[PDB]
Amino acid sequence: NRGRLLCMLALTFMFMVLEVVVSRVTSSLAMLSDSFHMLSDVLALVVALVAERFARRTHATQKNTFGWIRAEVMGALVNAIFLTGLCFAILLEAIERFIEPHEMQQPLVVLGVGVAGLLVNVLGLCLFHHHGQLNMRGVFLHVLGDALGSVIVVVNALVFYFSWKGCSEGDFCVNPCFPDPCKAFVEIIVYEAGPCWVLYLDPTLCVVMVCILLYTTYPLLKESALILLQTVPKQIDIRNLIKELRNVEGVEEVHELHVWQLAGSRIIATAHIKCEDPTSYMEVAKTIKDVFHNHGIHATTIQPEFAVVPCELACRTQCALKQCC
Amino acid sequence: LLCMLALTFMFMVLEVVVSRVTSSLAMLSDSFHMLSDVLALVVALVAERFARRTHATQKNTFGWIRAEVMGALVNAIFLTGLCFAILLEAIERFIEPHEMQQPLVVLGVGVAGLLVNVLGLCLQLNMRGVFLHVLGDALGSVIVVVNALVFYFSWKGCSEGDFCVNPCFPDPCKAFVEIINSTHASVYEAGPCWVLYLDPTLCVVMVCILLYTTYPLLKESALILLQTVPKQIDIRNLIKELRNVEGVEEVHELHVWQLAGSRIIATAHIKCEDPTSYMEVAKTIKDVFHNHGIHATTIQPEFASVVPCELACRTQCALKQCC
Ligand SMILES: CC(C)CCC[C@@H](C)[C@H]1CC[C@H]2[C@@H]3CC=C4C[C@@H](OC(=O)CCC(=O)O)CC[C@]4(C)[C@H]3CC[C@]12C
Ligand SMILES: [Zn+2]
Ligand SMILES: [Zn+2]
Ligand SMILES: [Zn+2]
Ligand SMILES: [Zn+2]
Ligand SMILES: [Zn+2]
Ligand SMILES: [Zn+2]
Ligand SMILES: [Zn+2]
Ligand SMILES: [Zn+2]
Question: What SS3 state is found at A62?
Answer: coil
Residue B6 Cα distances to A108, A120, B11, B18, B48, angstroms? 48, 44, 9, 18, 17
State how far the Cα of B303 lies from the Cα of B274, in Å rounded to an integer.
8
Decide if B252 contacts B269 (C-beta within 8 A): yes
Domain boundaries of chain A, sorted by first residue: 3-163+198-228, 169-193, 230-325
Resolution reading in Å = 4.2
| Residues sharing a CB contact under 8 Å with residue B142, sequence separation 6 or more, in sequence order | B110, B114
CATH class given for the domain over B2-155+190-225: mainly alpha
State how far the Cα of B100 lies from the Cα of B106, in Å rounded to an integer.
9
Decide if A163 contacts A193 (C-beta within 8 A): yes
State how far the Cα of B183 lies from the Cα of B228, in Å rounded to an integer.
71
State how far the Cα of A210 lies from the Cα of A87, in Å rounded to an integer.
6
- Domain A3-163+198-228 and domain A230-325, same fold? Reply is no
CB < 8 Å from A in window 217-276 of B: 222, 225-229, 235-236, 253-257, 259, 262-265, 267-269, 275-276
Length of chain B: 323
Decide if B172 contacts B220 (C-beta within 8 A): no
Domain A230-325 has CATH 3.10.180.10: no
Element (H, E) at A255: strand A251-263
Q: With an 8 Å Cβ cutoff, are B20 and A259 in contact?
A: no
Largest CA distance in chain A: 105
| Residues sharing a CB contact under 8 Å with residue B276, sequence separation 6 or more, in sequence order | A278
- State the DSSP string of A126-148: HHHTT---HHHHHHHHHHHHHHH
Residue located nearest, by CA, to atom 12 of ligand 1: B212
Length of chain A: 325
Pocket test for ligand 1, best of B82, B215, B221 (most atoms within 8 A of CB): B215
Sign for the CA dihedral angle at B284, B290, B291, B292 comes to positive
State how far the Cα of A199 lies from the Cα of A94, in Å rounded to an integer.
12
State how far the Cα of A267 lies from the Cα of A24, in Å rounded to an integer.
54
State how far the Cα of B75 lies from the Cα of A84, in Å rounded to an integer.
12
User: Does B197 contact A at CB distance below 8 Å?
Assistant: no
Of B307, B304, B305, B309, nearest to B322 (Cα)? B309
Question: What SS3 state is found at A154?
Answer: helix
Burial letters A115-140, b for 16+ CB under 10 A, else e: bbbbebbeebbeebeeeebbbbbbbb
How near does any CA of chain B get to the CA of A67, in Å? 8
- CA-nearest residue to B23 within chain A is A96
* Ramachandran region, residue A188 (left: φ > 0; alpha: ψ -120 to 50; beta: rest): left
Decide if A32 contacts B95 (C-beta within 8 A): yes
Residue B72, classified by CB atoms within 10 Å of its CB into exposed (0-12), middle (13-18) or buried (19+), is buried
- CA-nearest residue to A284 within chain B is B311
Q: Is B133 annotated as a binding residue?
A: yes
**What is the Cα gyration radius of chain A?**
29
State how far the Cα of B281 lies from the Cα of A306, in Å rounded to an integer.
13
* Residue among A169, A272, A299 minimizing CB distance to B177: A169
- CATH fold for domain B235-318: Alpha-Beta Plaits (3.30.70)
The answer to whether the CB of B212 is under 6 A from ligand 1 is yes
User: Does A20 contact B at CB distance below 8 Å?
Assistant: no
Chain A residues within 8 A of B240 when measuring between CB atoms: none
Decide if A115 contacts A155 (C-beta within 8 A): no
State how far the Cα of B120 lies from the Cα of B114, in Å rounded to an integer.
10
The answer to whether the CB of B62 is under 6 A from ligand 1 is no
Solved using: cryo-EM
State how far the Cα of B82 lies from the Cα of B87, in Å rounded to an integer.
9
Convert chain B into a string of H (helix), E (strand) and C (coil): CHHHHHHHHHHHHHHHHHHHHHCCHHHHHHHHHHHHHHHHHHHHHHHHHHHHCCCCCCCCCCCCCCHHHHHHHHHHHHHHHHHHHHHHHHHHHHHCCCCCCCHHHHHHHHHHHHHHHHHHHHCCHHHHHHHHHHHHHHHHHHHHHHHHHHHHHHCCCCCCCCCCCCCCCCCCHHHHHHCCCCCCCCCCCCCHHHHHCHHHHHHHHHHHHHHHHHHHHHHHHHHHHCCCCCCCCCHHHHHHHHHHCCCCCCECCCEEECCCCCCCEEEEEECCCCCCCCCCCHHHHHHHHHHCCCCEEEEEECCCCCCCCCCCCCHHHHCCCCC
Ligand nearest the Cα atom of residue B290:
7
Helix axes A29-55, A134-162, angle to 10 degrees: 170
Sign for the CA dihedral angle at B173, B174, B178, B179 comes to positive
State how far the Cα of A64 lies from the Cα of B238, in Å rounded to an integer.
14
Where are the alpha helices (H) located in chain A, listed in sequence order? 3-26, 29-55, 71-99, 107-128, 134-162, 182-188, 201-228, 238-246, 281-294
Give the DSSP letter of residue A179. Answer: P
Q: With an 8 Å Cβ cutoff, are B229 and A258 in contact?
A: no
Residue A201, classified by CB atoms within 10 Å of its CB into exposed (0-12), middle (13-18) or buried (19+), is middle
CA angle (B282 as vertex; B274, A301 as ends), nearest 5? 90
Question: What SS3 state is found at A271?
Answer: strand
State how far the Cα of A314 lies from the Cα of A93, in Å rounded to an integer.
56
Of A165, A164, A117, A166, nearest to A143 (Cα)? A117
Chain A residues within 8 A of B65 when measuring between CB atoms: 325
Residue A63: phi, psi to the nearest 5?
-75, -40
- CA-nearest residue to A83 within chain B is B81
Rounded to the nearest angstrom, the distance between the alpha carbon of B289 and the centre of ligand 5 is: 17
Q: Which CATH number fits domain A3-163+198-228: 1.20.1250.20, 3.40.50.300, 1.20.120.1760, 1.20.1510.10?
A: 1.20.1510.10
Q: Is B274 annotated as a binding residue?
A: no
How near does any CA of chain A get to the CA of B304, in Å? 9
Decide if B103 contacts B148 (C-beta within 8 A): yes
